[PDB]
Amino acid sequence: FLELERSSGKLEWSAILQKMASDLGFSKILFGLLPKDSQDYENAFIVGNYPAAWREHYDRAGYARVDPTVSHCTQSVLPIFWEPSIYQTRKQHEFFEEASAAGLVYGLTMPLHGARGELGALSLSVEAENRAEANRFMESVLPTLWMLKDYALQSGAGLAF
């Protein structure tokens, strides 16, 4: 994990994080971080390879207020798996279907809460033949991910702003 700490710039750091995630077996990621006093977007540091059409769709639809992982991050330090049970409201149901259309189906989000009051998330999505396979995989690497998210948080917070 030391390679993240030793990155000098955002481009280098992002490429290292993306490669680490890929080597682990996740094809898509989002790392997002806000400074302490900031609420919604605006000065958010966002990296990764989420589909650009999804990012724009999400913003226009005001999905920060719909996405169940966002509310979860505001109240918890524990991972939230993208299971059907988290998409409860009608808007969350459509959110799930639209995310799926954009290729985001199986995954998890690790909330990020930095020492300086940074608020964010490391989300990782996996391609799998089915949900059971995706969950077996995520469980198999969970302790590694749990360390990764804190290393990414500490190093990213130092570069983000």
Binds 29, which of a copy of itself, ligand K5G, none (CB < 5 to 8 A, cut-off by type)? none
Q: What is the rounded distance in angstroms from the CA atom of residue 1 to the CA atom of residue 9?
A: 16
What is each CA distance from 116 to 63, 76, 97, 112, 158, in whole angstroms? 26, 17, 36, 11, 10
Taking CB under 8 A as the rule, which mask of x and - marks residues 107-136 in contact with a copy of itself? ----x-xxxxx-------------------
DSSP helix/strand/coil, 77: coil
Q: Which stretch binds a copy of itself (CB under 8 A): 12-20, 44-52, 71-79, 91-99?
A: 71-79
The region that residue 62 occupies, defined by phi over 0 for left and psi between -120 and 50 for alpha, beta otherwise, is: left
Which of a copy of itself, ligand K5G, none does 132 bind, CB closer than 5 to 8 A by kind?
Answer: none
Size of the site for a copy of itself (CB under 8 A): 21
What CA–CA distance (Å, rounded) separates 69 from 71? 6
Q: Which does 94 bind (CB under 5 to 8 A by kind): ligand K5G, a copy of itself, none?
A: none
Closest to ligand K5G by CB, 16 or 87? 87
**150, interface contact from a copy of itself, ligand K5G, none, CB < 5-8 Å by kind:** a copy of itself
- Compute the least distance from the CB of residue 143 to ligand K5G, in Å: 21
* C-alpha angle 149-150-152 in degrees, rounded to nearest 5: 65
The answer to whether 16 touches 5, Cβ cutoff 8 Å, is no
Given a contact cutoff of 8 angstroms between Cβ atoms, the answer to whether 106 and 81 are in contact is no
Candidate ranges 48-56, 75-83, 94-102, 128-136; the one touching a copy of itself (CB under 8 A): 75-83
Summarize as ranges the residues that interact with a copy of itself (CB under 8 A). Answer: 73-78, 111, 113-117, 142-144, 146-147, 150-151, 153-154
